[PDB]
From a paper:
In bacteria and plants, the two independent catalytic reactions in the salvage pathway can be accomplished by a single enzyme, the fucokinase/GDP-fucose pyrophosphorylase ([name]). [name] can convert l-fucose into GDP-fucose via a fucose-1-phosphate (Fuc-1-P) intermediate, and has been applied to the chemical synthesis of fucose-containing glycans and glycoconjugates.
In the end, we got a cyro-EM structure of the full-length [name] at 4.0 Å resolution with a C1 symmetry. The GDP-fucose pyrophosphorylase domain contains a typical Rossmann fold and a left-handed β-helix fold. The fucokinase domain of [name], as predicted, adopts a GHMP sugar kinase fold. G76A, R80A, G88A and K89A mutants almost completely lose their GDP-fucose pyrophosphorylase activities. Taken together, it strongly suggests that this loop region is critical to the GDP-fucose pyrophosphorylase activity of [name] and may be the putative GTP binding site during catalysis. For the glycine-rich motifs, result shows that the T602A, G757A and G902A mutants have greatly reduced fucokinase activities, while mutants with R592A, D594A, G597A, G598A, D601A, G758A, G759A, Q761A, D762A, G899A and G901A, respectively, retain hardly any fucokinase activities.
Numbering used by the authors:
A (entry chain A): 544 to 949
B (entry chain C): 544 to 678
C (entry chain C), D (entry chain D): 815 to 949
Amino acid sequence: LDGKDYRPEEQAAFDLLRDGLLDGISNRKSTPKLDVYSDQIVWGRSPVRIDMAGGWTDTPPYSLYSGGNVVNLAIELNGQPPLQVYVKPCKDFHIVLRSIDMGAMEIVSTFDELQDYKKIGSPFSIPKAALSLAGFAPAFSAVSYASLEEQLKDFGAGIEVTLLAAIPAGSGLGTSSILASTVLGAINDFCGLAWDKNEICQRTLVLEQLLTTGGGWQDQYGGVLQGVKLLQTEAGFAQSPLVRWLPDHLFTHPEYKDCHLLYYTGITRTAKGILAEIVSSMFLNSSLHLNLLSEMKAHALDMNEAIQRGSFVEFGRLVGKTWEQNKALDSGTNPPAVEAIIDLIKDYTLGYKLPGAGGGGYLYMVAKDPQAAVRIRKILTENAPNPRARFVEMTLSDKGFQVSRS
Amino acid sequence: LDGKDYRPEEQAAFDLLRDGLLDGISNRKSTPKLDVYSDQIVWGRSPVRIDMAGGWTDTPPYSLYSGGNVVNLAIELNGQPPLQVYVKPCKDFHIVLRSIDMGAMEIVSTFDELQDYKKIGSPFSIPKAALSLAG
Amino acid sequence: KGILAEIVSSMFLNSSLHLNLLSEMKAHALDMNEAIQRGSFVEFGRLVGKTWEQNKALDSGTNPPAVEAIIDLIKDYTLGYKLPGAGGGGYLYMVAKDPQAAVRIRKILTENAPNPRARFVEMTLSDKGFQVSRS
Amino acid sequence: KGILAEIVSSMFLNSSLHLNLLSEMKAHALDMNEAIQRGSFVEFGRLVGKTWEQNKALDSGTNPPAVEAIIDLIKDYTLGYKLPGAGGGGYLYMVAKDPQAAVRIRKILTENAPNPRARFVEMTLSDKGFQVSRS
C-alpha cells in the first residue's frame, strides 16, 4: 500500500496464507494401498452443487474463522452425474494421467516433488494433488515408485487414471474442487487407505491449499453428498464440520409450482482472477465486506428455516435476495450481457441468481409455474449465442460416489 | 481334405467368404461430416444382449441364407449400460484412438489403408473399422 | 472361440445334421417367442434349458467341465439355464422358482468361488441405448 | 385406553414428576429431530428405544406382558423399538441393523403368532394425502 514490494508483500502474504492453511492434519501418512484387484475398473462419479444462498461465507478468510454457512444442494445434470473418474492398473510403471475434453496424456513417474503442480495448468494438475495421499511414506524413492506401485498395488501399473468432466471450469459450480474430491474418493476405494466422505473432503481441502486456488469449499461438501450442507462453523484452523440436513421436497415431490429453475449460459466466464482476490483482500482487516458477509450467514439461516418450513414463494424471495446480496454487493462483476438476460426477463415471475462465481457461467431462476415454460419460450425466442441457451435441468438426483465394478 | 493345400484351401475359402460378404451396400460414400460442434462431447452407450434361444441361426452360413431367428433381449448391467464411447475434436491432426482397460493410445494418421486392421489386435482394431464410414 | 466359428463356417449347406439341428433351433426360436408371448414363464424356463441342451449336447460340445461343476450343483433349485452366446467360458444365468433362487445365490455364495467372482450381477432389463452429444 | 387419557388429564400442572418427565419428552423430541436432521440413523434407533423406555417404564406402565414377550425375544437383533401412540395393544415397529431384520421377520414368522397376525405390514413412507373430487 505504501509503495514498495507489493509482489513480495503478496508473496509474504501468500506464503503466510499457505502456512496458515498448512496447519494441519493427520497424518501425512505412509500407507501401502493394495486393493484393486487387477481386472477391476474403478469408476467414480459425482453430482454438482449449486448454492442457493450462503454465498462467500465459505472461503478463508471467512468471518475469519468462524465459520460460515452455505446451505447449498447437491444436484445432477440430466445424466450422467457428470464428473466421473476411471482409474486402473496397468503394466508399465509410469503413472499416466489421462483426460478427456483436453487430455492427451500425462506420463508421470518422476515424481518430481510430488504433485503439487501449479506448473502447467493442464488440469492434470488436479490429479497431481490426487497423488498427494500423503503422498510420501517410508522408505521408497524416486526410482522406487517401482517400490511404491510394485509393492503397493503391486499390480505393476504405474497407475493410469482417467477422469472426465462434462463442463468447463468456467461454471461457477466448483467443478474443479468437486472433481479432485471425487478422485480422492476413488483412491480411497481404489487401492486402499479406507477413508470417510468427510475426511475425504478434509484432506481435499488440505490439498486445495496447495492447489492455491481460493478454497471455494462449500462445494466440496455440497456436490458430493445430497441436498443441504449446512453449518460452516469453526473455520480455524481450519476446523471443518458443517453437517446437517434438510428436505427437498419442493425440489421434488415436485412443487409443481415450477418445478424448477435451470440454466442460461450465453456467457463465458472472465474467469475469476479478481474475485478471490477481493475475498482474500481481505481478512478481518476490511471492510463492510465483513459486515455483509455476516448477514450472508444470517441470510443462510434465513434460507434453511424458510424452506425448512416450505415457504417456496419465500424461498424464491431469498434466492433473489442472495442475488442482490452479491450482485450489488461483493462482487459487482456481473457483466451487462448477464443483465440483458436478466433484463428480460425479471418478470415472469420471480427471481434468480448466478451460482458460485458469477461473471459468466449460468444462472437458474424460479417463476410461478408454467409461465416458467413460457420463459423457456422467451430464452428460446432470443438472446441466443452459441453458448446455448438451454433448459439443462437440475434434476436433483443424488448420492454420488463410485463403483469398483465388478 | 485330400491332402494338399488346406491353408491355401482355407485362404481360397476365406477370400471367397469375404467376397461373398463383400456384396454389397450403399454406397461406399464420400460424405463430409461436419456437426460436432467444437466444445461438445459426444458420449454414446449401450446395453448388452443375451440370447435366450435362437442360437447360431445367426452367423453366415445360416441355414445359408435364409434366415435365422434369434429372439434375444437387450439388457443392462447394473449401471452403466456399459460399453460407452466418448469422442471429441482436438487440435492436432492425428486421429487418436484411446482406450481404457488397455489403452495407452493409438496415434493415427496414415491411414494406412484404411482401417481395416486385423493387424495388431489391440482392439483399437475396432475403431479402425469405425473410420470405415466409407471411409 | 478359435474352434467355434470354424464349426460354424465348417460348414455351409455342405454338412451336416448341423443343418438339421440349426433348422429346429429356428423352430425353437419361434417356440420361444410364442411361449413368452403368451407368458408361460415356467415354459420359458423349459425352453431356455432346451436351448442349453440344444447347444451343449449339440454344436458345440465345448463347455468345459468346470462349467458343468457349476451346473452340477445346482441343476436343482429349481429350473434351467444356459450360457449365452459363445459358451466355453464367460458366464451363465439361470432361472429358479422364486426365492430358492436367492438360496441359489447362497449356494454359489457358499462354494465354487474362484476369483473370477461368483456374483449376482443383474440383468436388469433396462434399455434404449444410444448417445448424448451433450450439451 | 380408558385409563390412559385419565392419567393424562390427571393431571394438569397439579402433579407430578409427570410434568417433569413430560418436559424432557419435549427435550428428547428436539434430540430426535436434530439427530435425524443430521442422519445419525444408529442414534435415531437409540432415541426410539429411549422413547419406548420413556413411556413404558414411565407413564404409562400399561404395556401388557404379552407385548413384553414379543419384546422378549427379540430385543436382540439388533436394536430398539416402540409402540406408537397408545400402547397397551395395537402394534409396534422396530429397527435392526440390516437383513438380520429380515431374520427377525423370520423370528416372528417362527413363533408368537396368534390370529391377530404377525406380519410385515410396511410403512412405506408415502405421502401427501388428501382428496380427488374426480372428475
